[PDB]
Paper text:
Two histone chaperones, Vacuolar Protein Sorting 75 ([name]) and the Anti-Silencing Function 1 protein (Asf1), are involved in the Rtt109-dependent histone [name], [name], and H3K56 acetylation. Therefore, we propose that [name] regulates the HAT activity of Rtt109 by affecting the interactions between histones and specific histone chaperones rather than by forming a complex with Rtt109.
The PcVps75 dimer adopts a classic “head-phone” topology, which is characteristic of the NAP family. The PcVps75 protomer contains two major structural domains, a long α-helix at the N terminus (domain I, residues 18–58, colored green) and a α + β globular domain (domain II, residues 64–221, colored orange). Two major histone-binding surfaces were identified for the PcVps75 dimer, including the disordered C-terminal tail and a highly negatively charged region that included residues E192, D193, E194, E195, E196, E203, and D204. Similar to many histone chaperones, PcVps75 contains a long, disordered tail of acidic amino acids that interacts with basic histones, leading to charge neutralization. However, the interaction between PcVps75∆C-K5 and histones is completely abolished. Finally, we revealed that helix α7, which is located within the highly acidic concave surface of PcVps75, and the CTAD domain are both necessary for PcVps75 to interact with histones.
Author numbering:
A (entry chain B): 19 to 139, 145 to 168, 174 to 217
B (entry chain A): 20 to 139, 145 to 220
């Protein structure tokens, strides 16, 4: 067992501490977020304003002028880490009634699961996989057919192992947009 | 208003970030010490990891001559030794070389989180620091450059943040060392080791 072997093993210990730390983060921030979320819902167009105020190259860049008409009715956004593996992120979008989305799809939920295999096998690592989230577009308002922001909901990451815009966006929502929504909104004044 | 309620809540988030960082420190302190003991057995680990780290955050500030000094960097440590876990101490240790006198082989730079500075242009300046004295051997002082306007990496040690600028690249570098290079060092090293 070389020093090179020791280092790789110790790195596995760091991964476990990372998971322990996220567990603690989950306990800490869940009540704060729930409490924040029910105040934010009373602030008209809080989320499209915060998204617009967020760095455009992180999100705004992917949003059509038409995508923006849908997102104008985004009334709620939430991020969860609901699984025993705290690295899985669940992102929720809720829209008020509008001209584009059938009312079944006014609530859209997407789950990104940490993958052992994908993480194990540039090399800026891709770690996340997801299931296609179905959207019922109103006839005939389907922006999924430049590309629409809403195509992000079909991404799976199971086709290759490149770290793509969709996965990076998922992390931005979870680790930046969501914690900082209030700062971004206030920046907008 | 319901926007002044958001305010009160936002202060709770701020208390929680700090609580969370405090837990992080107790959690990782011994892991870093264990890791550091093994890394010291691995020659050139730090210059190899510095080199493999993203160039746009680090090696861009490193002239070839700087790099030559860094070939002799035998240890790098980051501490959060104070009450406020946002205070960072960054420690460089060098083996003997042509550039540093023996009492500058150990270089220590502390950054304090200043809430007054942080209260006052998107990732605004939050840290303050003291100049770290470096004793250079005769005619080896890399910070002494008039022409050749690009500052040696080593001018970073004199940054204080006590008088403010628009951006503070130096602070950005400090955070990168603390929050990216040091935690991801083994990952970076491994990328190089396995660029086969």
């Amino acid at each position: 067992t070389t020093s090179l072997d020791e280092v790789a093993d110790i790195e596995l210990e760091f991964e476990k501490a990372d998971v322990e730390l996220l567990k603690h983060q989950v306990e800490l921030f869940n009540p704060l977020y729930e409490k924040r979320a029910n105040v934010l819902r009373k602030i008209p167009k809080f989320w499209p304003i915060a998204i617009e105020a967020a760095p455009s190259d992180e999100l705004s860049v992917y949003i059509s002028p038409e995508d923006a008409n849908v997102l104008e009715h985004l009334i709620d956004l939430r991020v969860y880490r609901p699984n025993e593996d705290p690295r899985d992120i669940k992102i929720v979008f809720e829209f008020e009634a509008n001209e584009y989305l059938e009312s079944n799809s006014l609530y859209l939920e997407k789950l990104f699961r940490y993958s052992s295999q994908k993480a194990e096998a540039n090399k800026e690592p891709s770690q996340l996989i997801s299931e296609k989230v179905n959207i019922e577009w109103k006839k005939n308002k389907d922006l999924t057919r430049a590309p629409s922001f809403f195509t992000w909901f079909s991404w799976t990451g199971k086709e290759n192992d490149i770290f793509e815009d969709e996965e990076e966006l998922a992390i931005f929502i979870a680790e930046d947009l969501y914690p900082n929504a209030v700062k971004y909104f206030t920046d907008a004044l």
